[PDB]
Design a protein around this ligand. Structure first.
Ligand code: SF4
Ligand code: SF4
Ligand code: F3S
Ligand SMILES: [Mg+2]
Lengths: 534, 267
């Protein structure tokens, strides 16, 4: 029979941060899994005693992939603690920069992090560029010719012929691999668009710097609003709008059609990587103090019961440490959080990760695009319903197909397409508000000596929350509970597998030495380990 | 992964947020596809490489032992407390990995304030004993060129590499081992708000009409006067930089800036 025994993947590449995945396989299928995060920095320890205004600058450095998101969460958190209601324009500008972040992040994830699990770049060399151009022009309104793709092929040919394969060295597809299914022409189209996406993402990121100073690590948020008076000018708005329009065209005309062609070729991937429970915090508020004012609404679902979406109660979050490298075994609500590192090595005292294990009413929760999409869909979100229905119909599958590695990957595309369109709506509202004579972008505020605050962001990987306890006007406690912590943290003190661990059970492994199927599911969650551990 | 025609780059990730890697993806003229296909051979890089696990480790060994030589680019600080335990890749500590690989490089570039000077995880109380590359590896003779910033301007990385490939040597470096061609001026002496500074025209708050009109941000904490970087000159993403976005400089290309420049809104 097939392989039986352990597989270890360390490093898991094409993620952010340092992840070790361990699985036990039996007869060619995964029967057990451990998600082990192997770097700790301790930003929560470092923040103790500092000025709450300084928190966003430190916490932004939680992660430069999901850059800006933590600055936004800490600023929302200290805005909340201080009781300031920022001006409408600060809400628009913050929301527009976050929308741009999602488009950059998801485009780079699909092409530069996920697609080498499914695309054999060297097989593109054997493709017929004329055939490939016809396929590419059939799936997109954009017209692609044989010469267009030959140019890509020629460039790849000179690259491979030098013998210096660079980032493709020892790829799992080299020489062929039974779990890689694409024909040469589809591998060429995807490879062309991988290369294209390397330059398009420059524009997508630039859109953030138009208002937000720079990418990575924006520098335009303050307690009480934003600092960028230049963001009010017609010139900056026009610059942003042109970059957004080009980024949206790429999403609509290149990314989603490629996602659909690859998903169709890998329809067996509707059978692996499903999960039970979903949490999402909502995003793009009209009111900074009301989550239900967001374009996407918060919600909680247990055991895929989308007919009974539960309200999100922020007091029902606790972070477990029994299987994590921290002192003791007591789970804590983040306003009573503890970050007390204590390393025991891999599986010492049953501990195997630097991530805590967040649980909602005791349950492990997937967060991220699949949670945001399915919950919005089930709330009747018309835009989310319209494109997920079209994706389902194009693929010829039923909604059950969404509870899988394939469905998670498709949900990341659905949310990208929906957010790309909504950024235009937000831009228009912003323009309209300026036209009414509202040029205010920052509000005054005062620091309380004692306060509690929380800030909620639905980031490209899911529900992000920052929690502060202010004591003597300083940071008494600052806790980050980050989307990858939910999804990729370890087991809790009830020994419940986290979403990634549980999703790996059942994974087939054709070749234990090149376990691309494990990577396909792990990458579908878009792990960020600097985020998860901080 | 390599040998011949293009110079081999081994890119390591220690204790880092991956913002420095993202900054290189923003490379402009040349863009990152030209860089990876034409200029350089990128032979190890955990964020974007195809291989994982054992296959990735084999790719790394093959690149570092190549008879053709490699250049190392290092992102992130090295955690040294508790014998390096706080950071491991392939179940090796980052301290050990860098100890074994970086002395074999023909040249080492520390990219970003974490790799140059220790960075965010080295801020007080530094629970993981994080250190910059040259501090951590002093005893081994490693002297990395330091390209500072959080993250640095990618113009500064590509310019340093191109220099090095041309001249077979480091450019002139300052006393923090940073190239003077990029770090020789304060961001303040380059700043468009300098005439307001000279006139004592300071914004007293971010909501004020003075801030709306572009007055100097020094009273609001700007660290431009004590920070060396080329931000106002090169800008970021071909379009902006912190004080043109109305926010003070937080000093992010200086050693220990998380503790030296804080509170960020005071001077
Ligand atoms: S220097 Fe800044 S941007 Fe670069 S890895 Fe460190 S924290 Fe991230
Ligand atoms: S805004 Fe900052 S860098 Fe510019 S003149 Fe004022 S102190 Fe100097
Ligand atoms: S914060 Fe850093 S990016 Fe430049 S403007 Fe100051 S050195
Ligand atoms: Mg935390």
């Amino acid at each position: 029979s097939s392989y039986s025994g352990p597989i270890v993947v360390d490093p898991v590449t094409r993620i952010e941060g340092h992840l070790r995945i361990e699985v036990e396989v039996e007869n060619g299928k995964v029967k057990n899994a451990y998600s082990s995060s192997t770097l700790f920095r301790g930003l929560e320890i470092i923040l103790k005693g500092r000025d709450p205004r300084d928190a966003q600058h430190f916490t932004q450095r939680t992660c430069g992939v999901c850059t800006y998101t933590h600055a936004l969460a800490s600023t929302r958190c200290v805005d909340n603690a201080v009781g300031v209601h920022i001006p409408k324009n600060a809400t628009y500008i913050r929301n527009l920069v976050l929308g741009a972040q999602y488009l950059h992040d998801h485009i780079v994830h699909f092409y530069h992090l996920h697609a080498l699990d499914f695309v054999d770049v060297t097989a593109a060399l054997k493709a017929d560029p004329a055939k490939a151009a016809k396929v590419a022009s059939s799936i997109s309104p954009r017209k692609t010719t044989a010469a267009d793709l030959k140019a890509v092929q020629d460039k790849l040919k000179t690259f491979v012929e030098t013998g210096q394969l660079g980032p493709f060295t020892n790829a799992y597809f080299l020489g062929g691999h039974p779990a890689y299914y694409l024909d040469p022409e589809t591998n060429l189209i995807a490879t062309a668009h991988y290369l294209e996406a390397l330059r398009l993402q420059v524009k997508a990121a630039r859109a953030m710097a138009v208002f937000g100073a720079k990418n990575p690590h924006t520098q335009f948020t303050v307690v009480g609003g934003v600092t960028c008076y230049d963001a009010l000018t017609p010139q900056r708005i026009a610059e942003f709008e042109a970059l957004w329009k080009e980024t949206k065209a790429f999403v609509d005309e290149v990314y989603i059609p490629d996602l659909l062609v690859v998903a169709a070729a890998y329809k067996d991937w509707t059978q692996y990587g499903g999960t039970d429970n979903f949490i999402t915090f909502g995003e793009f508020p009209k009111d900074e103090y009301d989550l239900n004012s967001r374009f996407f609404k918060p919600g909680v679902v247990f055991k895929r019961d989308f007919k009974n979406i539960k309200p999100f109660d922020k007091m029902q979050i606790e972070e477990h440490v029994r299987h994590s490298w921290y002192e003791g075994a007591e789970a804590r609500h983040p306003w009573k959080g503890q970050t007390q590192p204590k390393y025991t090595d891999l599986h010492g005292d049953d501990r195997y990760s630097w991530m805590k294990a967040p649980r909602y009413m005791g349950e492990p929760m997937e967060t991220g695009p699949l949670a945001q999409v399915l919950i919005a869909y089930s709330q009747g979100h018309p835009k989310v319903k319209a494109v997920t229905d079209a994706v389902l119909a194009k693929l010829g599958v039923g909604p059950e197909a969404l509870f899988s590695t394939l469905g998670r990957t498709a949900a990341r595309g659905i949310e990208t397409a929906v957010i790309a369109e909504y950024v235009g709506v937000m831009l228009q509202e912003y323009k309209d508000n300026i036209a009414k004579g509202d040029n205010v972008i920052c509000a005054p505020w005062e620091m309380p000596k004692q306060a509690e605050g929380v800030g909620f962001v639905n980031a490209p990987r899911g529900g992000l929350s920052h929690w502060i306890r202010i004591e003597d006007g300083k940071i008494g406690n600052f806790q980050l509970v980050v989307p990858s912590t939910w999804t990729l943290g370890p087991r809790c003190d009830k020994n419940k597998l986290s979403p990634v661990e549980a999703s790996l059970i059942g994974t087939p492994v054709a070749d234990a030495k090149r376990p691309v199927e494990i990577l396909r599911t792990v990458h579908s969650f878009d792990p960020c380990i600097a985020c998860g551990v901080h | 992964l390599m040998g011949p025609r293009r110079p081999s780059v081994v890119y390591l990730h220690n204790a880092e947020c991956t913002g420095c890697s993202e900054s290189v993806l923003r490379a402009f003229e040349p863009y990152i596809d030209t860089l990876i296909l034409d200029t350089l051979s990128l032979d190890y890089h955990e964020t974007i490489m195809a291989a994982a696990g054992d296959a990735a480790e084999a790719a790394l060994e093959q690149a570092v032992n190549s008879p053709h030589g490699f250049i190392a680019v290092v992102e992130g600080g090295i955690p040294t407390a508790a014998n390096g335990i706080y950071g491991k890749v392939a179940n090796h500590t980052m301290l050990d990995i860098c100890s074994r690989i970086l002395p074999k490089a023909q040249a080492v570039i520390a990219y970003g304030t974490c790799a140059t000077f220790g960075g965010v995880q080295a801020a007080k109380p530094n629970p993981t004993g994080a250190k910059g590359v040259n501090d951590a590896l002093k005893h081994l003779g490693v002297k990395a060129i330091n390209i500072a910033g959080c993250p640095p301007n990618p113009y500064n990385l590509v310019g340093t590499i191109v220099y090095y490939l041309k001249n077979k040597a480091a450019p002139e470096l300052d006393s923090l081992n940073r190239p003077t061609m990029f770090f020789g001026q304060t961001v303040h002496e380059q700043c468009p708000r300098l005439p307001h500074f000279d006139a004592g025209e300071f914004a007293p708050s971010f909501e004020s009409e003075e801030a709306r009109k572009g007055w100097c941000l020094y009273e609001l904490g700007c660290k431009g006067p004590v920070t060396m970087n080329n931000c106002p000159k090169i800008k970021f993403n071909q379009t902006n930089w912190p004080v043109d976005a109305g926010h003070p400089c937080i000093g992010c290309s200086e050693p220990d800036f998380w503790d030296a420049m804080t509170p960020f809104y005071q001077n």
